Amino acid sequence: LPILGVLGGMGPVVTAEFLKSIYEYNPFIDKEQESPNVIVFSFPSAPDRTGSIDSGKEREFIDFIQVNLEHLNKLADCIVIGSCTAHYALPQIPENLKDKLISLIKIADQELQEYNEPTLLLASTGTYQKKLFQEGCTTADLIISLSESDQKLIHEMIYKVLKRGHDPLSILRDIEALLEKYNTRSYISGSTEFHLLTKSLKLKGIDSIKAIDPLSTIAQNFSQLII
Amino acid sequence: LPILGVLGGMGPVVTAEFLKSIYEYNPFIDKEQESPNVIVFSFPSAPDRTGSIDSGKEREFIDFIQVNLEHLNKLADCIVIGSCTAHYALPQIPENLKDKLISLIKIADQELQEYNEPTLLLASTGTYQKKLFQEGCTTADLIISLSESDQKLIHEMIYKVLKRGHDPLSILRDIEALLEKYNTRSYISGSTEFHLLTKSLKLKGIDSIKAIDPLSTIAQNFSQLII
Numbered sequence A, B: 001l002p003i004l005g006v007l008g009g010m011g012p013v014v015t016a017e018f019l020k021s022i023y024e025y026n027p028f029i030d031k032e033q034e035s036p037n038v039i040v041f042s043f044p045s046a047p048d049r050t051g052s053i054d055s056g057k058e059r060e061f062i063d064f065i066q067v068n069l070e071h072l073n074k075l076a077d078c079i080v081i082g083s084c085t086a087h088y089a090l091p092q093i094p095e096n097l098k099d100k101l102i103s104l105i106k107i108a109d110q111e112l113q114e115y116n117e118p119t120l121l122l123a124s125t126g127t128y129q130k131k132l133f134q135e136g137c138t139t140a141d142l143i144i145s146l147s148e149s150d151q152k153l154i155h156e157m158i159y160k161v162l163k164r165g166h167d168p169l170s171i172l173r174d175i176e177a178l179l180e181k182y183n184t185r186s187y188i189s190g191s192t193e194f195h196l197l198t199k200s201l202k203l204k205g206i207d208s209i210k211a212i213d214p215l216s217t218i219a220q221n222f223s224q225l226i227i
């Protein structure tokens, strides 16, 4: 049977919620033995992703990701890293340890190709500085970048609200105002913590916003993706 | 840093919710790097616990638990198995692979000692047949056993409602009627799936029922227990 390996804890709150999403969008028909097999390494002691760039200690962070990929390579058939910003480590990781990897940036790129309307990239300043989405996506011309001022505002939402476990709906007004400002009805979860907003939106039945949310997509399409 | 290993998937829904509970009851002060390190093996392809007793294939199940304990022994400092009924496998597992194990039955026993009032054991028929709580707990005289008829009713709640992800509050009336019938204001989560009821009770602010719930206790006391 096929096993998903999650390298998480890079948002422990969102890592936990992602595992919930998997079984929410894969309810069994008769028996639990039908349901997805998953291994989660939820290690919040991972050095801050943006912080490791903002200081100089990228090597410390790249070593963290590398060692834990070696582990999961032995245990899982496919692997996801639960942080977009953490994908900046990948060019420094050997190609053999990345064979099983399902990239959140590629997953986002595919969904945006099908959607084919301009969409607002919500992400960390470090994800922005590293230009992961602009350099990674075939659909980069459909990505609307936040201005520097609005980048900082999103960074605040991620760390002050979403990472601390607070009600993701408490930033919905701020996000609608951004979506309006940038003249669009959609966003990309450039930070994984917007998985939490995406879930809270689908719960309340708000379908005015279109969320390109890689973790939602991976959860929904587990059976197709995980081989 | 100390790592909890969860052998779960024996209620994928509740396994996911337990990981959520850990970070809910351990919110960080300044940085995420403060937060609990956890490894979860969420393998629902574990053979049904009660079913493996009800057929003859206990060996198949004991092998599952044994192999996955060997794995987690190498990776974690403390280990929890996310199913009370699955603890029936332990007498057949070598003592060396159980050094790190934190027993849900012992955790329940301790909480009941401090509580010191008669309490209703809600569990699977297989947990009842194996008499895990009655044989395991120093506080066994404080445990009120469900009659055979009410055992089947609880088994139905676990599999038809709680394991399928449905709103745990939808069985609250049925549980209050049991609690009344057996003349008590408390229950033991003899099935881990009653972690889900326990959380839904603490959310709505219902403190008329006292839940002896091992997973809640482990989540709350992570820093003390996990060394």
Ligand SMILES: N[C@@H](CCC(=O)O)C(=O)O
Pocket (backbone or CB within 6 Å): A010, A011, A049, A050, A082, A083, A084, A085, A086, A124, A127, A158, A190, A191, A192, A193
């Ligand atoms: N979790 C977000 C931002 C911060 C972090 O990585 O911890 C991400 O997708 O990268």
Ligand SMILES: N[C@@H](CCC(=O)O)C(=O)O
Pocket (backbone or CB within 6 Å): B010, B011, B049, B050, B082, B083, B084, B085, B086, B124, B127, B158, B190, B191, B192, B193
């Ligand atoms: N999850 C319950 C009952 C059924 C099962 O083990 O899957 C328990 O504590 O054992």
